[PDB]
Amino acid sequence: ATCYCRTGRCATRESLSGVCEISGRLYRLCCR
Amino acid sequence: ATCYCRTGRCATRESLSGVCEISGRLYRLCCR
């Protein structure tokens, strides 16, 4: 499992596996 | 995929697939 915290989109787009709003910014999780 | 940003550990432990330190917290990603 390799996932990472993105502040918006990541190179794959359709793979939003989680979200965390931290420091007023939305951190999406996209994982492979 | 269901992932979540945890500051320490999660119920699965070593499923840490990514990290992001934000606001002094280490956001470890573990996913299912």
Side-chain angles (χ1 to χ4, degrees):
Chain A
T2 304
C3 311
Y4 54 83
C5 311
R6 43 160 173 152
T7 53
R9 60 180 179 179
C10 59
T12 187
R13 270 286 297 161
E14 300 184 276
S15 185
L16 187 173
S17 53
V19 284
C20 47
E21 182 186 86
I22 313 171
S23 58
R25 190 182 306 204
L26 221 317
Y27 294 96
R28 286 167 181 100
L29 305 182
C30 54
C31 195
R32 60 190 184 207
Chain B
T2 306
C3 307
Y4 50 93
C5 312
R6 48 72 177 201
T7 52
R9 55 183 179 159
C10 51
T12 181
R13 270 288 301 183
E14 294 175 85
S15 183
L16 186 177
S17 52
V19 290
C20 48
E21 184 281 92
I22 315 173
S23 57
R25 284 165 177 175
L26 212 319
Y27 286 95
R28 291 166 181 108
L29 308 181
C30 49
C31 197
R32 68 190 190 204

